[PDB]
Design a binder for this molecule. Structure first.
Ligand SMILES: [NH3+]C[C@H](O)c1ccc(O)c(O)c1
Length: 392
């Protein structure tokens, strides 16, 4: 029946959540720098913005188990709507807060909102569709919104902030979220759909599988690279290249564009190149690009390594999703939500361990040494993907 509306709702929710996640990057560190300064200074700022950026991932990791039980007992629509309500509250807080603590609280609330939406929307979208093969395409469209949301984020936030102020982009996000919530609450309230009773193996024993662990570690490291890049590159650019405030999003644009291109091409080229081969090459490439990043002096020197990072991360994600699915289907019993639960756990871990440790290491020894360390870790972990050597 009216299932395309549900697909649209989930797509919009994921896109808006990722947009709100990635708009913060060019604006918050510069704003805190301007407050404090107008060296131990900006170093304490790096070590504090690391925690501020890791707060959302930590809260999401903690609150993820509870939302599944809640939607099991009560049904998807209430968590789906609560996600938009909490996202609206968090967006208004960021726009009208100046202190550090209120920014931390807004990020924490965004964590719960993101987790609730990511769980309940995926559950509804999986439940509503009838064909498993048709279910294959619709997930790709849902994740496509996530990749597109992180694309227009940094440039829209940075250019709008530098010309108008600190409030315009957050107000725009508030308006869009309110419109989406109005659509959700008005256009459809026909029935309250409950999740399927087919529950697979618990995530604990699933994570206890060594092959699942290898795939999860690969994904976690590949995402932790860019997760550590995100909250420190603006500060390094401002301190070294004395760049204006509108270029801090143009710096991150090529990475997102390359992520889109790499995901799209290798979602078709993976099974012809061999999935383990594609993942191995992706890990090696992202390691080398991360190694090459600190050698730039101008943005023109940052154009290429960001391209490589985005391309390789797309390769790794596209190669590692179906391998996770196949391993879960073979060694255990499988439901469509188990793969996304594993992927969400890996992503939240990569974004929770990245920024804090990255800030601490950058304060201790510097930015280039941190990038060298993470690149070498990626290079060393790359050959471990050989154990995904399934004969088909
Ligand atoms: N899965 C998303 C991935 O971490 C990511 C995030 C932001 C980006 O600009 C990107 O290229 C990739």
């Amino acid at each position: 029946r009216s299932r395309k509306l549900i697909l649209f709702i989930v797509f919009l929710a994921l896109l808006l959540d990722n947009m709100l996640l990635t708009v913060v990057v060019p604006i918050i560190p510069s704003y805190l720098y301007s407050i404090k300064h107008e060296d131990k200074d900006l170093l304490n700022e790096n070590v504090q913005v690391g925690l501020l950026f890791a707060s959302k991932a930590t809260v999401q990791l903690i609150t993820n188990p509870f939302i599944g039980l809640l939607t099991n007992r009560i049904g998807y629509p209430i968590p789906i709507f609560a996600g938009f309500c909490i996202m609206f509250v968090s967006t208004i807080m960021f726009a009208f807060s100046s202190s550090y603590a209120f920014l931390l609280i807004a990020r924490s609330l965004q964590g719960i909102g993101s987790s609730c939406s990511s769980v309940a929307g995926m559950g509804m979208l999986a439940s509503v569709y009838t064909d498993a093969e048709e279910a294959g395409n619709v997930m790709g469209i849902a994740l496509g919104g996530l990749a597109m949301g992180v694309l227009v984020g940094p440039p829209f936030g940075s250019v709008l902030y530098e010309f108008v102020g600190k409030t315009a982009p957050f107000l725009v996000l508030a308006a869009l979220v309110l419109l989406d919530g109005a659509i959700q609450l008005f256009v459809l309230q026909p029935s309250r759909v409950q999740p399927e009773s087919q529950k697979g193996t618990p995530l604990t024993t699933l994570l206890k599988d060594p092959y699942i662990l290898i795939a999860a570690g690969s994904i976690c490291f590949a995402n932790m690279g860019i997760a550590m890049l995100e909250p420190a590159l603006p500060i390094w650019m401002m301190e070294t290249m004395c760049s204006r405030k509108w270029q801090l999003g143009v710096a991150f644009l090529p990475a997102s564009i390359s992520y889109l291109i790499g995901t799209n091409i290798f979602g078709i080229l993976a099974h012809k190149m061999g999935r383990w081969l594609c993942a191995l090459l992706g890990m090696i490439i992202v390691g080398v690009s991360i190694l090459c990043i600190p050698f730039a002096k101008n943005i023109y020197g940052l154009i290429a390594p960001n391209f490589g990072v985005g391309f390789a991360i797309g390769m790794v994600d596209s190669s590692m999703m179906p391998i996770m699915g196949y391993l879960v289907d073979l060694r255990h019993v499988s439901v469509y939500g188990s793969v996304y639960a594993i992927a969400d756990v890996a992503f939240c871990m990569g974004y929770a361990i990245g920024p804090s440790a990255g800030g601490a290491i950058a304060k201790a020894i510097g930015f280039p040494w941190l990038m060298t360390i993470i690149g070498i870790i990626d290079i060393l972990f790359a050959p471990l993907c050989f154990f995904l050597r399934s004969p088909p």
